[PDB]
Amino acid sequence: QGWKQRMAAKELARQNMDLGFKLLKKLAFYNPGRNIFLSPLSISTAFSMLCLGAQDSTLDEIKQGFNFRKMPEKDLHEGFHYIIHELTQKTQDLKLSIGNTLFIDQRLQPQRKFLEDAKNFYSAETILTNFQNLEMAQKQINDFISQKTHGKINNLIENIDPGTVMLLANYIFFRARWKHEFDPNVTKEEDFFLEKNSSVKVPMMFRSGIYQVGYDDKLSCTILEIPYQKNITAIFILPDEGKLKHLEKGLQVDTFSRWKTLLSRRVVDVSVPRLHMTGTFDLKKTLSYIGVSKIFEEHGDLTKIAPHRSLKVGEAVHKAELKMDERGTEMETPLVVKIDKPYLLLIYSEKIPSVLFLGKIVNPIGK
C-alpha cells in the first residue's frame, strides 16, 4: 500500500501551492505587464532532489525555504517519488514529464549512492559535460534536453558562467485531452484586451456546457474550471476590471480552499484563448524570493554529490511548457465567461494533489 506516500504527497501539494503564490507575487511585483508561467511542483522536485546530496547549512536552508521541514526526509523523498511516478505519462489523454538533469564537469566523479537515489526517487539523471568549452557545453545541454523532450523544451540554456562545474536543468511539459473537446470549427479570432482600451486578436476557443463556476467578492474575480480527461483541472481566475493587482496580493493557501466553496456546476458559454506558453527562470534569482542561496555557494556541503572542496550549483534553470488547444475526449440558461483580458491560470492535479502550473497571462499570444 502507498497510503503513507499519498499522505506525504498531500502535504507537499499544500507547500507547492503556497510556493507558487509567493513566487507569482514577487515576480509580478518586480515585472508587471509580463506573462509569468512556471511550475511550482517542478521547481520543488529539483531542490528536494538536491537534498539527497546536500548536508548541513545548505540542506537546512533548502528545507527551511521550501518548507520541507514538517515530515521526515524519508517521507519527503517517498512523497515526491509518488507524485512524479503518478503524473509521468505518455498516453492519448496525458503527456507529462518532469525532467531533472544535473550537468557535471567530466573531471568530477558523481557518487553512486546519490546517482541511484536521484534516479530511483526522482527519475533525475547526471550527464558529464566539458565546461572548459562553454559554447559546446550549452549546445550539448540544449540538444540533450530538446531530444529527450521531443522538441518540447528547447534553448533551455542561454548562458553559462565560466567556472561552472555543475548546472541544474529542471523542466516540465504538458499535453492533455480535455474531458470534453472544443470544436475547432467554432474557434475564432476575437479581441483580447491587453488594457481596457487596447486589444489584439487571439484564437479564442468556445464551448457551451456544464462547468464548475463561481465568483469571489473578496478578491473580485470570476472562477471557472475546465476539467481534463485525467483527474487534472484548468482553473481560470478572471479579475474584474482594475482588480488584477488586488487579486495577486490576496493569493494564499486558504484563498484556493475558499474558491472551491464558491463553485457550483452550471451551464456556461465559455470563451478561452488557445495557448502555447513557455516560461524560463534563472533559479538562483527566483529562489532569492524564498531565501535559498547556499546551494549556489561553496560551503563543503555537496560531497555526497561529488568530492570537491569548492562544489556548488553554478547555475540552475527552470523551464515550463504547455499547450492549450481544442483536443479532448469525444437545461438552464447559460452563464457567460469570456477569458479576454489578463487572467491567472492554475493547472491543478486533483487525484495526485498538486499545482502543476501557475500562470499570469497578460497576453495569450505574447512571448
Numbering used by the authors: 37 to 366, 378 to 414
Article excerpt on this structure:
Previously, visceral adipose tissue-derived serpin (referred to as vaspin in this paper; serpinA12 according to the serpin nomenclature) was identified as a putative member of the serine protease inhibitor family, which was expressed in visceral adipose tissue of Otsuka Long-Evans Tokushima Fatty (OLETF) rats at the age when obesity and insulin plasma concentrations reach a peak. Here, we provide the vaspin crystal structure and identify human kallikrein 7 (hK7) as a first protease target of vaspin inhibited by classical serpin mechanism with high specificity in vitro. We provide evidence that the serpin function of vaspin is essential for its physiologic effects and demonstrate that the anti-diabetic vaspin effects in vivo do not result from increased insulin sensitivity but are rather based on an insulin-stabilizing effect most likely by inhibiting hK7-mediated insulin degradation.
Based on sequence homology with α1-antitrypsin vaspin has been predicted to belong to the serpin protein family. After expression, purification and crystallization of recombinant human vaspin, X-ray structure determination confirmed the typical structural core domains of serpins consisting of three β-sheets and nine α-helices. As expected, nearby regions match closely in a superposition onto related serpins. The fold corresponds to that of free serpins or serpins involved in a transient complex, i.e. the long central β-sheet consists of five strands. The reactive center loop (RCL) (extending from G364 to P381) is flexible in the vaspin structure. The P15 glycine is located in a tight turn between anti parallel β-strands and is highly conserved within the serpin family, most likely because torsion angles in this conformation are only allowable for the least restricted amino acid glycine in the Ramachandran plot. It has been shown that the serpin inhibitory mechanism is critically dependent on the length of the RCL and is furthermore structurally based on conserved small side-chain amino acids within the hinge region of inhibitory serpins. The variant vaspinA369P fails to inhibit hK7 activity and the mutation prevents complex formation with the protease. Comparison of the RCL sequences of vaspin and other prominent serpins suggested methionine 378 as P1 residue, though tyrosine is the preferred P1 residue. Indeed, we could confirm methionine 378 as P1 residue for hK7 in vaspin by mass spectrometry.
